[PDB]
Amino acid sequence: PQITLWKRPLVTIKIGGQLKEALLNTGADDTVIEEMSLPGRWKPKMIGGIGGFIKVRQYDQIPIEIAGHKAIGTVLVGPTPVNIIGRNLLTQIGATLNF
Amino acid sequence: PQITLWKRPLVTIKIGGQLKEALLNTGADDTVIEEMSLPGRWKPKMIGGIGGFIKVRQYDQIPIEIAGHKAIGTVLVGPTPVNIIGRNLLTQIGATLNF
């Protein structure tokens, strides 16, 4: 699709068989999701936002569907204000910015 | 142009007679620029994201050039870690997400 930006670019994602809403975010290096249960081991990660830095749990190689498109990659879990799909997965679904 | 998302989508902007580098940010409602002087009235605002909130000055009807494209809109000024072009000005240059 072609998504204009008059509204927030929110899409439905699927992770661990559950549907969630998430924001397609070209300003984010990484993908960050609200607290949830994911399989496997996690590693520590610090990420920085507009208000400062927070600690999150890094899970690698997680299957996730984004607006119907399949991806498998790193998902960070932590106290984010909104679920965010960052460039690590935007590249997997072939997303570009155009003007 | 078509901008891939392998790296941060940085572009050159001109604002208040100054050249700056800024991030094209579809996950941002607003445009936020590091400390600088702008003409006209302003009012205070709190904006939030990962890590909490910062206080910024809101300037309305500010002319800007973004990667060669002219627009006008609200610009927030304050202690942001990176200059951000948000959706309020991304729309004006006709930027879309495509996949």
PDB file of C-alpha atoms in Angstrom:
ATOM      1  CA  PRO A   1       0.000   0.000   0.000  1.00  0.00           C
ATOM      2  CA  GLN A   2       0.787   3.694  -0.103  1.00  0.00           C
ATOM      3  CA  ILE A   3       0.247   5.273   3.292  1.00  0.00           C
ATOM      4  CA  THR A   4      -0.165   9.023   3.638  1.00  0.00           C
ATOM      5  CA  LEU A   5       0.656  10.706   6.934  1.00  0.00           C
ATOM      6  CA  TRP A   6      -2.332  12.924   7.704  1.00  0.00           C
ATOM      7  CA  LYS A   7      -3.141  10.361  10.419  1.00  0.00           C
ATOM      8  CA  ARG A   8      -0.761   8.219  12.475  1.00  0.00           C
ATOM      9  CA  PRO A   9       0.396   5.279  10.334  1.00  0.00           C
ATOM     10  CA  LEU A  10      -1.156   2.599  12.547  1.00  0.00           C
ATOM     11  CA  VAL A  11      -1.417  -0.968  11.301  1.00  0.00           C
ATOM     12  CA  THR A  12      -2.405  -4.317  12.743  1.00  0.00           C
ATOM     13  CA  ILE A  13       0.440  -6.678  13.573  1.00  0.00           C
ATOM     14  CA  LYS A  14       0.399 -10.322  14.664  1.00  0.00           C
ATOM     15  CA  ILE A  15       2.895 -11.668  17.160  1.00  0.00           C
ATOM     16  CA  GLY A  16       2.595 -14.924  19.102  1.00  0.00           C
ATOM     17  CA  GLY A  17      -0.805 -15.447  17.492  1.00  0.00           C
ATOM     18  CA  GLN A  18      -2.155 -12.198  18.958  1.00  0.00           C
ATOM     19  CA  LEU A  19      -3.305  -9.116  17.064  1.00  0.00           C
ATOM     20  CA  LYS A  20      -1.980  -5.736  18.189  1.00  0.00           C
ATOM     21  CA  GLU A  21      -1.991  -2.190  16.833  1.00  0.00           C
ATOM     22  CA  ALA A  22       1.423  -0.677  16.033  1.00  0.00           C
ATOM     23  CA  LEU A  23       2.905   2.501  14.598  1.00  0.00           C
ATOM     24  CA  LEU A  24       5.061   2.349  11.465  1.00  0.00           C
ATOM     25  CA  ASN A  25       8.001   4.443  12.648  1.00  0.00           C
ATOM     26  CA  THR A  26      10.831   5.524  10.336  1.00  0.00           C
ATOM     27  CA  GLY A  27      12.276   7.466  13.257  1.00  0.00           C
ATOM     28  CA  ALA A  28      12.953   4.291  15.221  1.00  0.00           C
ATOM     29  CA  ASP A  29      16.002   2.058  14.719  1.00  0.00           C
ATOM     30  CA  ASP A  30      14.280  -0.787  16.506  1.00  0.00           C
ATOM     31  CA  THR A  31      10.888  -2.358  17.081  1.00  0.00           C
ATOM     32  CA  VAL A  32       9.474  -1.907  20.589  1.00  0.00           C
ATOM     33  CA  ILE A  33       6.315  -3.578  21.895  1.00  0.00           C
ATOM     34  CA  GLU A  34       4.343  -3.203  25.148  1.00  0.00           C
ATOM     35  CA  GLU A  35       4.775  -5.869  27.845  1.00  0.00           C
ATOM     36  CA  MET A  36       3.907  -9.343  26.601  1.00  0.00           C
ATOM     37  CA  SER A  37       5.200 -12.901  26.823  1.00  0.00           C
ATOM     38  CA  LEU A  38       7.673 -14.067  24.176  1.00  0.00           C
ATOM     39  CA  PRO A  39       9.575 -17.381  23.930  1.00  0.00           C
ATOM     40  CA  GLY A  40      13.270 -18.001  24.466  1.00  0.00           C
ATOM     41  CA  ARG A  41      16.018 -16.048  26.183  1.00  0.00           C
ATOM     42  CA  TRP A  42      16.368 -12.301  26.159  1.00  0.00           C
ATOM     43  CA  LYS A  43      19.323  -9.910  26.336  1.00  0.00           C
ATOM     44  CA  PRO A  44      19.564  -6.424  27.860  1.00  0.00           C
ATOM     45  CA  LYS A  45      19.181  -3.345  25.707  1.00  0.00           C
ATOM     46  CA  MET A  46      19.117   0.378  26.353  1.00  0.00           C
ATOM     47  CA  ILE A  47      17.209   2.560  23.911  1.00  0.00           C
ATOM     48  CA  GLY A  48      16.886   6.325  23.770  1.00  0.00           C
ATOM     49  CA  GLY A  49      13.791   8.339  22.971  1.00  0.00           C
ATOM     50  CA  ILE A  50      12.686  11.960  23.125  1.00  0.00           C
ATOM     51  CA  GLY A  51      12.551  11.898  26.926  1.00  0.00           C
ATOM     52  CA  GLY A  52      15.672   9.889  27.711  1.00  0.00           C
ATOM     53  CA  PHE A  53      16.758   6.252  27.944  1.00  0.00           C
ATOM     54  CA  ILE A  54      14.913   3.129  29.069  1.00  0.00           C
ATOM     55  CA  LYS A  55      15.857  -0.524  29.567  1.00  0.00           C
ATOM     56  CA  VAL A  56      14.030  -3.136  27.519  1.00  0.00           C
ATOM     57  CA  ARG A  57      14.180  -6.882  26.896  1.00  0.00           C
ATOM     58  CA  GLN A  58      15.647  -7.895  23.525  1.00  0.00           C
ATOM     59  CA  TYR A  59      14.233 -11.046  21.887  1.00  0.00           C
ATOM     60  CA  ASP A  60      15.805 -12.154  18.609  1.00  0.00           C
ATOM     61  CA  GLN A  61      14.377 -13.945  15.586  1.00  0.00           C
ATOM     62  CA  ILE A  62      10.706 -13.484  16.521  1.00  0.00           C
ATOM     63  CA  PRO A  63       8.100 -14.115  13.824  1.00  0.00           C
ATOM     64  CA  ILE A  64       5.838 -11.123  13.349  1.00  0.00           C
ATOM     65  CA  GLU A  65       3.311 -10.223  10.696  1.00  0.00           C
ATOM     66  CA  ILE A  66       2.959  -6.512   9.868  1.00  0.00           C
ATOM     67  CA  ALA A  67      -0.061  -5.357   7.850  1.00  0.00           C
ATOM     68  CA  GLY A  68      -0.115  -8.849   6.336  1.00  0.00           C
ATOM     69  CA  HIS A  69       3.614  -8.952   5.536  1.00  0.00           C
ATOM     70  CA  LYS A  70       5.804 -11.614   7.144  1.00  0.00           C
ATOM     71  CA  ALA A  71       8.953 -10.679   9.047  1.00  0.00           C
ATOM     72  CA  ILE A  72      11.259 -12.469  11.506  1.00  0.00           C
ATOM     73  CA  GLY A  73      13.515 -10.355  13.652  1.00  0.00           C
ATOM     74  CA  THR A  74      14.404  -8.575  16.817  1.00  0.00           C
ATOM     75  CA  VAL A  75      11.582  -7.410  19.029  1.00  0.00           C
ATOM     76  CA  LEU A  76      12.229  -5.237  22.093  1.00  0.00           C
ATOM     77  CA  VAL A  77       9.745  -5.423  24.964  1.00  0.00           C
ATOM     78  CA  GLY A  78       9.375  -2.552  27.401  1.00  0.00           C
ATOM     79  CA  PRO A  79       7.446   0.516  28.633  1.00  0.00           C
ATOM     80  CA  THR A  80       6.804   2.156  25.286  1.00  0.00           C
ATOM     81  CA  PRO A  81       3.899   4.614  24.934  1.00  0.00           C
ATOM     82  CA  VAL A  82       2.763   2.869  21.733  1.00  0.00           C
ATOM     83  CA  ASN A  83       3.792  -0.298  19.898  1.00  0.00           C
ATOM     84  CA  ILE A  84       6.427   0.755  17.377  1.00  0.00           C
ATOM     85  CA  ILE A  85       7.590  -0.939  14.192  1.00  0.00           C
ATOM     86  CA  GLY A  86      11.125   0.325  13.570  1.00  0.00           C
ATOM     87  CA  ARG A  87      13.518   0.213  10.657  1.00  0.00           C
ATOM     88  CA  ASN A  88      14.805  -3.272  11.484  1.00  0.00           C
ATOM     89  CA  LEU A  89      11.420  -4.700  10.415  1.00  0.00           C
ATOM     90  CA  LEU A  90      10.354  -1.957   8.009  1.00  0.00           C
ATOM     91  CA  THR A  91      13.275  -3.059   5.810  1.00  0.00           C
ATOM     92  CA  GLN A  92      12.102  -6.690   5.923  1.00  0.00           C
ATOM     93  CA  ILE A  93       8.671  -5.753   4.564  1.00  0.00           C
ATOM     94  CA  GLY A  94      10.222  -3.579   1.852  1.00  0.00           C
ATOM     95  CA  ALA A  95       9.029  -0.217   3.137  1.00  0.00           C
ATOM     96  CA  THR A  96      10.395   3.014   1.699  1.00  0.00           C
ATOM     97  CA  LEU A  97       9.721   6.717   2.184  1.00  0.00           C
ATOM     98  CA  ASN A  98       8.704   8.538  -0.969  1.00  0.00           C
ATOM     99  CA  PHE A  99       8.131  12.142  -1.951  1.00  0.00           C
TER     100      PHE A  99
ATOM    101  CA  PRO B   1      13.090  10.579  -4.145  1.00  0.00           C
ATOM    102  CA  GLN B   2      12.653   7.084  -2.781  1.00  0.00           C
ATOM    103  CA  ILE B   3      14.378   6.604   0.553  1.00  0.00           C
ATOM    104  CA  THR B   4      15.213   3.128   1.783  1.00  0.00           C
ATOM    105  CA  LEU B   5      15.362   2.490   5.491  1.00  0.00           C
ATOM    106  CA  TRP B   6      18.626   0.567   5.836  1.00  0.00           C
ATOM    107  CA  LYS B   7      19.916   3.707   7.568  1.00  0.00           C
ATOM    108  CA  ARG B   8      18.261   6.579   9.409  1.00  0.00           C
ATOM    109  CA  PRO B   9      16.428   8.722   6.841  1.00  0.00           C
ATOM    110  CA  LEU B  10      18.336  11.963   7.383  1.00  0.00           C
ATOM    111  CA  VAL B  11      17.911  15.011   5.161  1.00  0.00           C
ATOM    112  CA  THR B  12      19.061  18.609   5.079  1.00  0.00           C
ATOM    113  CA  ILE B  13      16.579  21.253   6.149  1.00  0.00           C
ATOM    114  CA  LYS B  14      16.631  25.023   6.177  1.00  0.00           C
ATOM    115  CA  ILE B  15      14.901  26.725   9.068  1.00  0.00           C
ATOM    116  CA  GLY B  16      15.262  30.213  10.502  1.00  0.00           C
ATOM    117  CA  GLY B  17      18.012  30.856   7.981  1.00  0.00           C
ATOM    118  CA  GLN B  18      20.030  27.920   9.323  1.00  0.00           C
ATOM    119  CA  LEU B  19      20.969  24.613   7.702  1.00  0.00           C
ATOM    120  CA  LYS B  20      20.414  21.540   9.858  1.00  0.00           C
ATOM    121  CA  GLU B  21      20.292  17.776   9.479  1.00  0.00           C
ATOM    122  CA  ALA B  22      16.962  16.197  10.468  1.00  0.00           C
ATOM    123  CA  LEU B  23      15.322  12.783  10.687  1.00  0.00           C
ATOM    124  CA  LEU B  24      12.192  12.049   8.631  1.00  0.00           C
ATOM    125  CA  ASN B  25      10.004  10.577  11.365  1.00  0.00           C
ATOM    126  CA  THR B  26       6.648   8.979  10.564  1.00  0.00           C
ATOM    127  CA  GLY B  27       6.297   8.055  14.247  1.00  0.00           C
ATOM    128  CA  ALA B  28       6.260  11.727  15.284  1.00  0.00           C
ATOM    129  CA  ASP B  29       3.105  13.859  15.347  1.00  0.00           C
ATOM    130  CA  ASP B  30       5.158  17.035  15.548  1.00  0.00           C
ATOM    131  CA  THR B  31       8.372  18.554  14.248  1.00  0.00           C
ATOM    132  CA  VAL B  32      10.993  19.127  16.957  1.00  0.00           C
ATOM    133  CA  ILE B  33      14.249  21.006  16.517  1.00  0.00           C
ATOM    134  CA  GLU B  34      17.246  21.454  18.831  1.00  0.00           C
ATOM    135  CA  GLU B  35      17.604  24.803  20.610  1.00  0.00           C
ATOM    136  CA  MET B  36      17.565  27.768  18.247  1.00  0.00           C
ATOM    137  CA  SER B  37      15.936  31.159  17.968  1.00  0.00           C
ATOM    138  CA  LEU B  38      12.759  31.610  15.921  1.00  0.00           C
ATOM    139  CA  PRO B  39      10.718  34.777  15.295  1.00  0.00           C
ATOM    140  CA  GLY B  40       7.257  35.460  16.689  1.00  0.00           C
ATOM    141  CA  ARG B  41       5.151  34.303  19.600  1.00  0.00           C
ATOM    142  CA  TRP B  42       5.501  30.925  21.251  1.00  0.00           C
ATOM    143  CA  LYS B  43       3.817  28.949  23.991  1.00  0.00           C
ATOM    144  CA  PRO B  44       5.114  26.108  26.130  1.00  0.00           C
ATOM    145  CA  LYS B  45       4.301  22.449  25.420  1.00  0.00           C
ATOM    146  CA  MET B  46       5.147  19.046  26.850  1.00  0.00           C
ATOM    147  CA  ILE B  47       5.887  16.284  24.370  1.00  0.00           C
ATOM    148  CA  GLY B  48       6.509  12.666  25.213  1.00  0.00           C
ATOM    149  CA  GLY B  49       7.772   9.403  23.867  1.00  0.00           C
ATOM    150  CA  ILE B  50      10.229   6.719  24.870  1.00  0.00           C
ATOM    151  CA  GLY B  51      11.811   7.863  28.145  1.00  0.00           C
ATOM    152  CA  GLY B  52       9.134  10.364  29.120  1.00  0.00           C
ATOM    153  CA  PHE B  53       8.579  14.041  28.376  1.00  0.00           C
ATOM    154  CA  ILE B  54      10.497  17.197  27.552  1.00  0.00           C
ATOM    155  CA  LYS B  55       9.351  20.818  27.609  1.00  0.00           C
ATOM    156  CA  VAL B  56       9.529  22.666  24.287  1.00  0.00           C
ATOM    157  CA  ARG B  57       8.540  26.033  22.843  1.00  0.00           C
ATOM    158  CA  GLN B  58       5.802  25.905  20.223  1.00  0.00           C
ATOM    159  CA  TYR B  59       6.170  28.306  17.255  1.00  0.00           C
ATOM    160  CA  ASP B  60       3.372  28.446  14.688  1.00  0.00           C
ATOM    161  CA  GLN B  61       3.461  29.382  10.977  1.00  0.00           C
ATOM    162  CA  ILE B  62       7.198  28.773  10.583  1.00  0.00           C
ATOM    163  CA  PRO B  63       8.584  28.460   7.045  1.00  0.00           C
ATOM    164  CA  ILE B  64      10.828  25.488   6.424  1.00  0.00           C
ATOM    165  CA  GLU B  65      12.603  23.804   3.527  1.00  0.00           C
ATOM    166  CA  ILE B  66      12.939  20.015   3.711  1.00  0.00           C
ATOM    167  CA  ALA B  67      15.233  18.316   1.188  1.00  0.00           C
ATOM    168  CA  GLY B  68      14.475  21.134  -1.238  1.00  0.00           C
ATOM    169  CA  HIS B  69      10.718  21.179  -0.632  1.00  0.00           C
ATOM    170  CA  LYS B  70       9.157  24.291   0.917  1.00  0.00           C
ATOM    171  CA  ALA B  71       6.464  24.079   3.572  1.00  0.00           C
ATOM    172  CA  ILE B  72       5.116  25.935   6.577  1.00  0.00           C
ATOM    173  CA  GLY B  73       3.857  24.731   9.928  1.00  0.00           C
ATOM    174  CA  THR B  74       4.332  24.460  13.658  1.00  0.00           C
ATOM    175  CA  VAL B  75       7.847  23.848  14.882  1.00  0.00           C
ATOM    176  CA  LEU B  76       8.691  22.791  18.416  1.00  0.00           C
ATOM    177  CA  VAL B  77      12.040  23.890  19.859  1.00  0.00           C
ATOM    178  CA  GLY B  78      13.778  22.241  22.788  1.00  0.00           C
ATOM    179  CA  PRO B  79      16.235  19.640  24.067  1.00  0.00           C
ATOM    180  CA  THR B  80      15.528  16.851  21.584  1.00  0.00           C
ATOM    181  CA  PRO B  81      18.367  14.355  21.039  1.00  0.00           C
ATOM    182  CA  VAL B  82      17.888  14.579  17.267  1.00  0.00           C
ATOM    183  CA  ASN B  83      16.181  17.057  14.922  1.00  0.00           C
ATOM    184  CA  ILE B  84      12.864  15.463  13.906  1.00  0.00           C
ATOM    185  CA  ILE B  85      10.568  16.193  10.967  1.00  0.00           C
ATOM    186  CA  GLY B  86       7.179  14.896  12.043  1.00  0.00           C
ATOM    187  CA  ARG B  87       3.933  14.217  10.216  1.00  0.00           C
ATOM    188  CA  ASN B  88       2.717  17.827  10.362  1.00  0.00           C
ATOM    189  CA  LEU B  89       5.392  18.752   7.809  1.00  0.00           C
ATOM    190  CA  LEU B  90       5.874  15.354   6.152  1.00  0.00           C
ATOM    191  CA  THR B  91       2.342  15.687   4.766  1.00  0.00           C
ATOM    192  CA  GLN B  92       3.193  19.038   3.236  1.00  0.00           C
ATOM    193  CA  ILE B  93       6.040  17.683   1.132  1.00  0.00           C
ATOM    194  CA  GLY B  94       3.795  14.802   0.060  1.00  0.00           C
ATOM    195  CA  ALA B  95       5.764  12.085   1.839  1.00  0.00           C
ATOM    196  CA  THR B  96       4.294   8.585   1.920  1.00  0.00           C
ATOM    197  CA  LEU B  97       5.229   5.155   3.273  1.00  0.00           C
ATOM    198  CA  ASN B  98       5.209   2.492   0.575  1.00  0.00           C
ATOM    199  CA  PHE B  99       5.483  -1.297   0.638  1.00  0.00           C
TER     200      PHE B  99
END
